[PDB]
Write a protein that binds this ligand. Structure first.
Ligand code: HEM
Ligand SMILES: *[C@@H]1O[C@H](CO)[C@@H](O)[C@H](O)[C@H]1NC(C)=O
Ligand SMILES: *[C@@H]1O[C@H](CO)[C@@H](O)[C@H](O)[C@H]1NC(C)=O
Ligand SMILES: *[C@@H]1O[C@H](CO)[C@@H](O)[C@H](O)[C@H]1NC(C)=O
Ligand SMILES: [Mg+2]
Length: 323
């Protein structure tokens, strides 16, 4: 079952003796999410980068104080499109045999590195998949985050910096990635993720939304908590996303096979239709990976879809693609 919220959500030392940072061993998997990467590299998750949904939810709550609803939605969304529903295992990065025997095509079980399922374009510190690598830390892009932090954050990353950098990344992808896609689930996650460094990488004794560049580099590049790192003092995820959107409001869309051809998709959900984002994720994304599942895969799908729905905000109607 999905874990429930923390019994004690106060700030505390999370870079503690039981969770030391260690470097990667051969075969250890890290991916496009610096949160999950850091949790693996401190042993909140298995250090090889392969984990169950329940392990992921427990780790994001205990290590960073990610809120329960957000943890459940993100984890089950990722597992449904990128994980192995029979073995209950998800890679936090590249596709691996460690998640078990694969289901039939068209399901990919490609881990979090799979482009266009959860991962997508205009990431802050990772390049678009079209440019060859959607998962490793990118120094040029991080130096641009440092530059935007120096320009709009007084040297720190905050929500003002997030608003400017989010737009700059979208504009850069429009100008250079002929396959740029910015609709539905990615449209939502691309905005929320820009608040996470300000809300979750800032030491919880301060919780001031001002992330220093030493801490930023430690998390984004080395999957490493600063020495003496205290997690946030309460559960949260995307608080302040409205500031990022307000800086440069965008409509969902995509380049249409050429640079500078950004075309709005009226069938995409946006922030006016959050329930549509969930319904399309299940009815289109999940169903297309598993269009005619066998009995045991259907059961695992329905269970994980029920868990996903627990992370949906109230007032949406649950949808049942397999009955
Ligand atoms: C709850 C389970 C979570 C899952 C399944 C998840 C998964 C992902 C994935 C697949 C991406 C890549 C999206 C992209 O940029 O293309 C991503 C990005 C990101 N995640 Fe997570 N994540 C989770 C929780 C967290 C937590 C707890 C943090 C912070 C402590 C975090 C911070 C980030 C950040 C900052 C990015 C954007 C990286 C960038 O744009 O350079 N995530 N996540
Ligand atoms: C990192 O991003 C820059 C800027 O988009 C790109 O030119 C470069 O090829 C990427 N990869 C690296 C530095 O490995
Ligand atoms: C970011 O920092 C700059 C400089 O200190 C400040 O002007 C701006 O208000 C800050 N924004 C937030 C949301 O803290
Ligand atoms: C999803 O499918 C359900 C039927 O299972 C239907 O009621 C709903 O309107 C569909 N939503 C979308 C956005 O396709
Ligand atoms: Mg990406």
């Amino acid at each position: 079952l999905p874990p429930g919220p923390l019994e004690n959500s106060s700030a505390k030392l999370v870079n503690d003796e039981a969770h030391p940072w260690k470097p990667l061993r051969p075969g250890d998997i890290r991916g496009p999410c610096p949160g999950l990467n850091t949790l693996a590299s401190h042993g909140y998750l298995p250090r090889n980068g392969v984990a169950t949904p329940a392990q992921i939810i427990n780790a994001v709550q205990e290590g960073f104080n990610f809120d329960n609803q957000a943890a459940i939605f993100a984890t089950y969304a990722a597992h449904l499109v990128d994980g192995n529903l029979i073995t209950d295992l998800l890679s936090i990065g590249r596709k691996t045999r460690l998640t078990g025997p694969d289901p039939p095509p068209p399901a990919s079980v490609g881990g979090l590195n799979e482009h266009g399922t959860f991962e997508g374009d205009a990431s802050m510190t990772r390049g678009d998949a079209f440019f060859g690598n959607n998962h490793d830390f990118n120094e040029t892009l991080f130096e641009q985050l440092v530059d935007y932090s120096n320009r709009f954050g007084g040297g720190k990353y905050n929500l003002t910096v997030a608003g400017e950098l989010r737009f700059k990344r979208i504009q850069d992808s429009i100008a250079t990635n002929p396959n740029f896609s910015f609709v539905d689930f990615r449209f939502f996650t691309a905005y929320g993720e820009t608040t996470f460094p300000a809300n979750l990488f800032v030491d919880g004794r301060r919780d001031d939304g001002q992330l220093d560049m030493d801490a930023a580099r430690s998390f984004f590049q080395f999957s490493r908590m600063p020495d003496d790192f205290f997690r946030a003092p309460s559960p949260r995820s995307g608080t302040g996303v409205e500031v990022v959107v307000q800086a440069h409001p965008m409509q969902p869309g995509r380049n249409v096979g050429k640079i500078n051809s950004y075309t709005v998709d009226p069938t995409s959900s946006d922030f006016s239709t959050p329930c549509l984002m969930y319904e399309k994720f299940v009815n289109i994304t999940v169903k297309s990976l598993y269009p005619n599942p066998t009995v045991q895969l259907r059961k695992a799908l329905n269970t994980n879809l029920d868990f996903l729905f627990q992370g949906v905000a109230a007032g949406c109607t649950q949808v049942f693609p397999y009955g």
